[PDB]
């Protein structure tokens, strides 16, 4: 699937990401745009051999199992495929762990590069949430 700024905002809001550990909803939407550009099936194979999955491009060598990364960990304890659903619950929960696992949203460099320190309320401006 390929959400739309607002369509995603809603879903993420519904899944309780708005002000999760202090992170305004805008933060997560903006994060998605720069990671998967809102495409739930987005997947990128990295040279280390891992692969980023879905809307938030979670990496296979750490949070999910894809069976293609030998040393891989599965911190979120789920199959990487899970993060490819058209429903975002998979990524959204895993995301909460990653962030609340003490890592913060700095976990996503994109968030750092493109979202940190930017009026992010803008990614939900004009959305009936």
């Amino acid at each position, epitope marked *: 699937k390929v959400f739309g700024r607002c369509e995603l905002a809603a879903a993420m809001k519904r899944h309780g990401l708005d002000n999760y550990r202090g992170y305004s909803l805008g933060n997560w939407v903006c994060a998605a745009k720069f990671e998967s550009n809102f495409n739930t099936q987005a997947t990128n194979r990295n040279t280390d051999g*891992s692969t980023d999955y879905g809307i938030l491009q979670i990496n296979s060598r750490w949070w999910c199992n894809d069976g293609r990364t030998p040393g891989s960990r599965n911190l979120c304890n789920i199959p990487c495929s899970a993060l490819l659903s058209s429903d975002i619950t998979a990524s959204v929960n895993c995301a909460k762990k990653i962030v609340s696992d003490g890592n913060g949203m700095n976990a*996503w*460099v994109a968030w750092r590069n493109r979202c940190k320190g930017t009026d992010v309320q803008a990614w939900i401006r004009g959305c009936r949430l």
Partner: nanobody
Amino acid sequence: VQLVESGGGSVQAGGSLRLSCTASGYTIGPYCMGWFRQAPGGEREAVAAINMGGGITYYADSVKGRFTISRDNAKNTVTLQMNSLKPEDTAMYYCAADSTIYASYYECGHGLSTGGYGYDSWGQGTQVTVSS
């Protein structure tokens, strides 16, 4: 998330010298480990970074080709093998580790290059003096 440093000292021109660093962090990570160095007259410069997990390396054009970073056996221990040493290499070397377990894929070369954004844990340093 404490780092211990070994090796170093004075080596002669064209010589090789091994530096080692073990992140006693003992939790989950670190994600990155690399070295930075600094001469008297000089801002802290990047040397090398290796990606714990995946083992991808990144070097500064200044040491790329000579130096080699890698993971030693011992848990959270990386090793910087400095070869074809030049006096310009004389300086204080600092081990650093990024304790952040990145969600998507991250390359340690980025942080290292850009002044070290990400590297939250630092060593005390080890002096390396390449006697001309």
